[PDB]
Design an enzyme around this catalytic site. Sequence first.
Site, mmCIF file in Angstrom:
data_model
loop_
_atom_site.group_PDB
_atom_site.id
_atom_site.type_symbol
_atom_site.label_atom_id
_atom_site.label_comp_id
_atom_site.label_asym_id
_atom_site.label_seq_id
_atom_site.Cartn_x
_atom_site.Cartn_y
_atom_site.Cartn_z
ATOM 1 N N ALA A 292 71.327 66.579 1.752
ATOM 2 C CA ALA A 292 70.787 65.454 0.997
ATOM 3 C C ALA A 292 70.943 64.147 1.760
ATOM 4 O O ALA A 292 70.004 63.345 1.828
ATOM 5 C CB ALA A 292 71.469 65.358 -0.368
ATOM 6 N N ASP A 338 45.537 37.051 34.862
ATOM 7 C CA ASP A 338 44.583 36.684 35.894
ATOM 8 C C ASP A 338 43.523 35.752 35.314
ATOM 9 O O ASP A 338 43.364 35.634 34.097
ATOM 10 C CB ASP A 338 43.913 37.935 36.475
ATOM 11 C CG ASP A 338 43.007 37.617 37.652
ATOM 12 O OD1 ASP A 338 43.323 36.613 38.325
ATOM 13 O OD2 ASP A 338 41.984 38.326 37.883
ATOM 14 N N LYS A 501 32.249 32.609 55.351
ATOM 15 C CA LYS A 501 32.417 31.995 54.043
ATOM 16 C C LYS A 501 33.839 32.266 53.575
ATOM 17 O O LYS A 501 34.487 33.218 54.014
ATOM 18 C CB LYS A 501 31.396 32.513 53.020
ATOM 19 C CG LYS A 501 31.611 33.939 52.576
ATOM 20 C CD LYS A 501 30.702 34.263 51.407
ATOM 21 C CE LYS A 501 31.111 35.563 50.726
ATOM 22 N NZ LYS A 501 30.943 36.754 51.609
ATOM 23 N N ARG A 664 46.363 29.523 43.815
ATOM 24 C CA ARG A 664 46.365 29.832 45.251
ATOM 25 C C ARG A 664 47.497 30.798 45.605
ATOM 26 O O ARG A 664 48.367 30.516 46.427
ATOM 27 C CB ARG A 664 46.452 28.558 46.088
ATOM 28 C CG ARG A 664 45.130 27.834 46.268
ATOM 29 C CD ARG A 664 44.058 28.754 46.834
ATOM 30 N NE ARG A 664 42.772 28.068 46.969
ATOM 31 C CZ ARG A 664 41.587 28.652 46.817
ATOM 32 N NH1 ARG A 664 41.517 29.939 46.516
ATOM 33 N NH2 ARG A 664 40.470 27.947 46.959
ATOM 34 N N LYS A 670 52.082 37.062 42.769
ATOM 35 C CA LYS A 670 51.983 37.489 41.378
ATOM 36 C C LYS A 670 53.104 38.460 41.039
ATOM 37 O O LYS A 670 53.764 38.334 40.001
ATOM 38 C CB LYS A 670 50.625 38.135 41.112
ATOM 39 C CG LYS A 670 49.449 37.363 41.628
ATOM 40 C CD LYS A 670 48.190 37.749 40.888
ATOM 41 C CE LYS A 670 46.978 37.100 41.517
ATOM 42 N NZ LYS A 670 45.860 36.987 40.541
ATOM 43 N N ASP A 689 41.995 42.245 36.276
ATOM 44 C CA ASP A 689 40.717 42.913 36.473
ATOM 45 C C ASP A 689 40.573 43.544 37.848
ATOM 46 O O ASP A 689 39.895 44.564 37.976
ATOM 47 C CB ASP A 689 39.552 41.927 36.256
ATOM 48 C CG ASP A 689 39.311 41.012 37.467
ATOM 49 O OD1 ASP A 689 40.110 40.067 37.695
ATOM 50 O OD2 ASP A 689 38.325 41.251 38.204
ATOM 51 N N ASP A 693 45.523 42.127 41.387
ATOM 52 C CA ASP A 693 46.451 42.227 40.274
ATOM 53 C C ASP A 693 47.170 43.565 40.224
ATOM 54 O O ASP A 693 48.062 43.740 39.391
ATOM 55 C CB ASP A 693 45.710 42.005 38.953
ATOM 56 C CG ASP A 693 44.927 40.708 38.935
ATOM 57 O OD1 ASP A 693 45.571 39.637 39.042
ATOM 58 O OD2 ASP A 693 43.676 40.761 38.822
HETATM 59 N N1 ACP Z 1 33.874 38.053 49.843
HETATM 60 C C1 ACP Z 1 34.734 36.797 49.845
HETATM 61 N N2 ACP Z 1 34.454 36.200 51.007
HETATM 62 C C2 ACP Z 1 35.063 35.028 51.342
HETATM 63 N N3 ACP Z 1 35.965 34.467 50.484
HETATM 64 C C3 ACP Z 1 36.245 35.062 49.316
HETATM 65 C C4 ACP Z 1 35.642 36.227 48.982
HETATM 66 N N4 ACP Z 1 36.099 36.598 47.784
HETATM 67 C C5 ACP Z 1 36.981 35.668 47.362
HETATM 68 N N5 ACP Z 1 37.063 34.718 48.321
HETATM 69 C C6 ACP Z 1 37.888 33.518 48.338
HETATM 70 O O1 ACP Z 1 39.439 33.916 48.502
HETATM 71 C C7 ACP Z 1 40.103 33.186 47.682
HETATM 72 C C8 ACP Z 1 41.304 33.996 47.155
HETATM 73 O O2 ACP Z 1 40.903 35.327 46.908
HETATM 74 P P1 ACP Z 1 41.499 36.018 45.511
HETATM 75 O O3 ACP Z 1 40.733 37.237 45.174
HETATM 76 O O4 ACP Z 1 42.931 36.369 45.682
HETATM 77 O O5 ACP Z 1 41.329 34.897 44.339
HETATM 78 P P2 ACP Z 1 39.973 34.852 43.406
HETATM 79 O O6 ACP Z 1 39.775 33.484 42.855
HETATM 80 O O7 ACP Z 1 38.817 35.217 44.255
HETATM 81 C C9 ACP Z 1 40.115 36.100 42.044
HETATM 82 P P3 ACP Z 1 41.558 35.886 40.909
HETATM 83 O O8 ACP Z 1 41.378 34.716 39.944
HETATM 84 O O9 ACP Z 1 41.633 37.186 40.156
HETATM 85 O O10 ACP Z 1 42.859 35.686 41.694
HETATM 86 C C10 ACP Z 1 39.103 32.883 46.538
HETATM 87 O O11 ACP Z 1 39.375 31.660 46.022
HETATM 88 C C11 ACP Z 1 37.764 32.816 47.231
HETATM 89 O O12 ACP Z 1 37.498 31.378 47.608
HETATM 90 CA CA CA Z 2 68.098 64.237 3.243
HETATM 91 CA CA CA Z 3 67.746 60.534 -1.199
HETATM 92 MG MG MG Z 4 40.061 38.632 39.273
#
Ligand code: ACP
Ligand code: CA
Ligand code: CA
Ligand code: MG
Length: 974
Positions: A292, A338, A501, A664, A670, A689, A693
């Site tokens: 019980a 993120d 770039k 930056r 992270k 995403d 991360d």
């Molecule tokens: N194919 C690519 N070619 C050149 N530069 C890139 C690029 N993709 C991202 N970057 C640059 O690199 C920097 C840092 O990259 P990272 O991926 O860590 O931050 P993010 O802002 O692109 C994504 P998150 O917010 O998830 O950190 C970005 O700010 C972007 O300016």
């Molecule tokens: Ca019990």
């Molecule tokens: Ca009981």
């Molecule tokens: Mg991202």
Amino acid sequence: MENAHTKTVEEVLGHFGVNESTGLSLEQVKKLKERWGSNELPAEEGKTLLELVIEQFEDLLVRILLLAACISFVLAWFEETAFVEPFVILLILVANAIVGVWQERNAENAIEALKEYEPEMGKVYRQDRKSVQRIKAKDIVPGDIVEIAVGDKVPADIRLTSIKSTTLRVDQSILTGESVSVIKHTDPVPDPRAVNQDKKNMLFSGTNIAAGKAMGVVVATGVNTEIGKIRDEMRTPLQQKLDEFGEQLSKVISLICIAVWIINIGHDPVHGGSWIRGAIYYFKIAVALAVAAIPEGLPAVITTCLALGTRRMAKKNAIVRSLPSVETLGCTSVICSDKTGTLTTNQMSVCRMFILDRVEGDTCSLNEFTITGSTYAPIGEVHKDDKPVNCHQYDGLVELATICALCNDSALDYNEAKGVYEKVGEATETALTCLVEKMNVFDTELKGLSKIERANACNSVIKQLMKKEFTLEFSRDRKSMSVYCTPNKPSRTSMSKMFVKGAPEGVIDRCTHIRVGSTKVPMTSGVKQKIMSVIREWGSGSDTLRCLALATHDNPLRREEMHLEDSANFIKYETNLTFVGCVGMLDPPRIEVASSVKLCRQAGIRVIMITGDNKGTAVAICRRIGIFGQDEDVTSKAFTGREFDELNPSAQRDACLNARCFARVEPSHKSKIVEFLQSFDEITAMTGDGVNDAPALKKAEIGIAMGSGTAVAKTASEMVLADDNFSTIVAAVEEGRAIYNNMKQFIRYLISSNVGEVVCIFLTAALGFPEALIPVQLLWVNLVTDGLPATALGFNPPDLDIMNKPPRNPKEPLISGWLFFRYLAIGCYVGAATVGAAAWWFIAADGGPRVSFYQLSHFLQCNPDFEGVDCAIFESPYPMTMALSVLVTIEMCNALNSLSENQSLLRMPPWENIWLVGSICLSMSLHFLILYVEPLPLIFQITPLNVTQWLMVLKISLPVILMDETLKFVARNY
Ligand SMILES: Nc1ncnc2c1ncn2[C@@H]1O[C@H](COP(=O)(O)OP(=O)(O)CP(=O)(O)O)[C@@H](O)[C@H]1O
Ligand SMILES: [Ca+2]
Ligand SMILES: [Ca+2]
Ligand SMILES: [Mg+2]
């Protein structure tokens, strides 16, 4: 075909009759889907009906109750009714076990209905489209060219045919156990018996791509796939705090129940002088009381609750892939997150851009433009001064467009079923693709182009004039990406170039000249600030633009001179760069994000943004969301990476408790930032995403991944939001706090009720009253009070005020000091108030003999002083019915005080939990049944109660809720 990995690339393509460029014909597919089939696995093992039942009965507290029904079955085999004792111990073990299986089943049905909702895609090259296009993973067949890039999941089994990055890296842990990622190549491995880890020109279905981009030929799909052959092969932190309580509670029961066997050693008159027959009957009581008092349903309820929680989460479109992750989410006190793909819709379009106009000394004007088009569609136009321009007239814009087309690992892909354009590859790079479509810097006639060929139409005019010899893949430490190009036109005035770039702050340091339309000049300090200021108000502005720079290398090294093996040399080759311009992107915060920061601040949960983007952009979005106020001073609450490393640990641990925004920041930081947040005893959850991360997602106590995000990020996290609905996180937290609240009310009911069951046995012994219950009755209050009524507590609704209290610390004692007192005080009454039920009949009640109180204490003694009283009246079945009913009804009433912790029975009424009603009716029905049906009272030794006894049973029970109601009042009013 077998042993693809030993044959060369030319061999494996000729086997299927495909070329790498154009891919597989429409006839070829239907033929190979006949010979091979759909690229999928069939059904599932799931759970047989019996396995679920068996793991329910595997448990310490449920084994012991089985024994007590074997004992009660062995002794009942010598009784010459005792057969009901084991049957009624089996009854409560089977009621509490049935609910557990139903919840487990129809929750299992919920996770599989959600996981198999959105169809897995795969990028292929077929002959209906000159460009890459994504089809369902299942309509992939051995033969068609497949393309894969970073973060992608491998859809089939592929023989690598060409890597486009300088190296390609794969996480094969699911199939090989390899924790670290691995490299690949396209040459043949000759060992034909080689195990999977040394098949280095191969990808396998199920694994992810850690870095790079390649393409290959599918060699096996479906079940013939390396991971599909193995298909047949093959403790939460609260449960551990609960099992410590499960054993340590049975310890005091064993004592209390051995005590209950020693006190009555003197009683034997009624058994026939056989102390062998005298002491058998009380071992039956010590077992009956032990049965019980034991919380038999405690295990079955914990797993019922975690099963119900996963059910409710899948209904909110959240895949829970780790059963302790919903419970842990309750105690979360900080939620890292993120930016780009998570807090942000990740739906980008270049909407601002500029090239230089003229440079004279420190002065300089620039040509800014605006681009229209919110979405990925290549429809939109380019304004200067809010009127359209021909972009081929500006020479610098021609170059700006060249760099966006050629320094791009991505493309646009028209989804003819949905009638939209989707990204092949990464958002940022797609937004540049969609931009060179709007610019059309070569005045190319898009008049008659299908909606399919409209996606990448102008990109190809640029690519026709430039052979892309190699590409120095993007790396998150130098924050840039490069491409080596040579013009298809003969070399005389045109030479090779690199196209760069990347993040503008880092790109512009390596810029030593500036392209002014058609000419080049040295980079001055006045121009660097024209640029950095334009970048600043683009990012602090209304749309919170995300922006990068674009540069050209006019005298790069030769293909031979360049040492491309060590990635640390890539940044060395992009150094004497010529600035061309900047583009500004677009990226709204997700609609439900802002209201979630408000609900988490309110529940004691700090949210922190960890990102890799510009600090301006980052802070500007914390102001939109609400992490910061539109006029807050963020001077000590927001740091870039370098700013957090150049800190004394005294004021660097000062930052890790106040700062709400780290920008930056590289994938290591992270992870380090979460580390710090943990070393302050905070349960952290991280939301991501993308591929950067992933290190942070494992480190957090809970990692939550976005549904539309990468596979490499989902692989690293315990929960997945298939929705993308950020509000689900808060709902998941509320659910986890709701499960812990419900274990306590279950405890508070079973502990308070069952101490009374014990208090009333140790009371009638103290006053020498005749014993109140026989084994078959304790095993009835056991079945009837501790069964379905108690289990129904797992469905309580949330507290009206549940999300306004701060997170509770898991380094607590399970049960408070006050709570322990509250258990006893109620159950102390419960034991008392049910002994007074036996005493009421014997003195004050009209229907019972008004025996003197002296006479009741020494009822054994009857006859000079106990004269006037018959002798057999003391064992009338009237006081035993009167107590056993008060017990079941007291316990039923005290089962309603367990609806909420401190919310009184008026704010939270008993109809908020319907199931707790149905159980109290069923047990009151079961009690009414053995009390009034024809042959049953004899087995349980009870008298059918008349009409006015119950008005004294109620008159004693309802006071148990008046007691706890006043306990609840003192709780909240202090
Ligand atoms: N194919 C690519 N070619 C050149 N530069 C890139 C690029 N993709 C991202 N970057 C640059 O690199 C920097 C840092 O990259 P990272 O991926 O860590 O931050 P993010 O802002 O692109 C994504 P998150 O917010 O998830 O950190 C970005 O700010 C972007 O300016
Ligand atoms: Ca019990
Ligand atoms: Ca009981
Ligand atoms: Mg991202």
